[PDB]
Amino acid sequence: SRITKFFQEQPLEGYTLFSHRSAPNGFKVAIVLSELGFHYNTIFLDFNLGEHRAPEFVSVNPNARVPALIDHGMDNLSIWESGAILLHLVNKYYKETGNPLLWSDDLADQSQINAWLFFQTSGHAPMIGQALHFRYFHSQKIASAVERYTDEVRRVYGVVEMALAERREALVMDYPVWLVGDKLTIADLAFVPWNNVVDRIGINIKIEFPEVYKWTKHMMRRPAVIKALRG
Amino acid sequence: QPLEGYTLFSHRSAPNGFKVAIVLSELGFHYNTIFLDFNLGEHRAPEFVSVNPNARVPALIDHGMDNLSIWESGAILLHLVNKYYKETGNPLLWSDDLADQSQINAWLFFQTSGHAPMIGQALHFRYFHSQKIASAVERYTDEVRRVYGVVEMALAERREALVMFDYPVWLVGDKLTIADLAFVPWNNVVDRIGINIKIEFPEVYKWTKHMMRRPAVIKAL
Ligand SMILES: N[C@@H](CCC(=O)N[C@@H](CS)C(=O)NCC(=O)O)C(=O)O
Ligand SMILES: N[C@@H](CCC(=O)N[C@@H](CS)C(=O)NCC(=O)O)C(=O)O
16 A cells, blocks of 8 residues: 555655665665766655555566666666666756766766676675575575675675776775776676675675775765665 | 677677677677686686676677776666767667667666676575575575566556556567667576576566567567
8 A cells, every 4th residue: 555555646756666675786776876966756665564565566667676776767677687687767867967087978988887886786795695595585595505605795795806806906006996987887786785785794804805805895984875874 | 819800708698698799789799708717717817807807708899999897797788878869869779869768777787786686596495505405595586586577567467557468568668778788698597497488477588589589689588
């Protein structure tokens, strides 16, 4: 009924974000939404009550998961999957202002940003999710499963660490270093919500991945990011 | 290293590698494939890790673009349809409408983040884990069937609309896109984890059959 009422009379402009109070992927969208200056309203779906089952929500996101975004200005267009939401946001911002904030007007750069974005959504987040699952929520304890996924997460963080280290090495020839085109992009921001969750699986970023540490801290100090995470 | 064309790094049994070959074929781009033997650990060679810092396949080199390196199947697919549309003005396997593109990307990220990884884990605990654990296998097999349930339902609704009947149905804009092709290589392997598409998901069966009959797809595979 709660969510049902919302779809009774939807806003005419702005954005509505469906998420969950402890969903890193939700904050990933909130962050980009905030950085781009997009005004939005967040609805925290109560999965316990099965609000994600509400025919109204499944219609927004057939996968029945969060986040899902409704672009009211575009006839209530619904975009699901955090990766697709980010691309929708930077593409829209760019065509509206002519300024590719957190993005790039260059095909070559966009493909590099996409590579990191797909790497994050497909190789980073899913793995952190599996490690958390076997470490805390599986029907039985499986040490071999925990080790498999925890190792993979450290491995992917090593890929990020190495890339950041190489970017620094190139400049030297504490200054902020970024993954693509020496500028902050959604490729960097996408990791932020999760870099804060990996401690739960025994990973200490500050000590284990120095470069990732500086990188994440630079982003955590940005107003738009602080505002989004406080939401 | 060529001046034009594309060089695709993949593996003989890598569904993600074939996903790229398929799109490269359909779009008419000329490419040559370099198969890596994870035996010798060719994917751990400095020169390859320079192409893909993740040391995984696929990885694509766009020679015409100063040997630009692109890794992650999803990013590779977006690069190809973007480049093709820019060159021809025809959004083959894509769309020139912002709304449509967001839907294509939705399904694309869904396939790469919730489909391929889950099938991958089902296969691992089923065939290659150091220990045999049914609950691990069930967890992923159940998730894969749930994912197909989402596709099946989407295709059924699209079918329902067409009715208001032997015609192909697609995920976005009543036309074949990278959203559809992205599933092809993986649909062909789920039988290894006990999923019978023909029986369990009728619409997916037809959908994958229409795709599997395309000449460009046959050639690539
Ligand atoms: N690949 C998806 C992940 C979607 C996802 O797993 N969302 C989580 C929250 S971080 C969720 O909805 N969890 C509730 C559930 O799985 O029941 C994306 O990036 O949007
Ligand atoms: N999310 C990546 C998946 C990359 C991946 O895991 N590729 C497999 C082949 S399908 C691979 O390189 N396997 C070798 C290994 O894991 O050592 C993509 O879509 O390209």
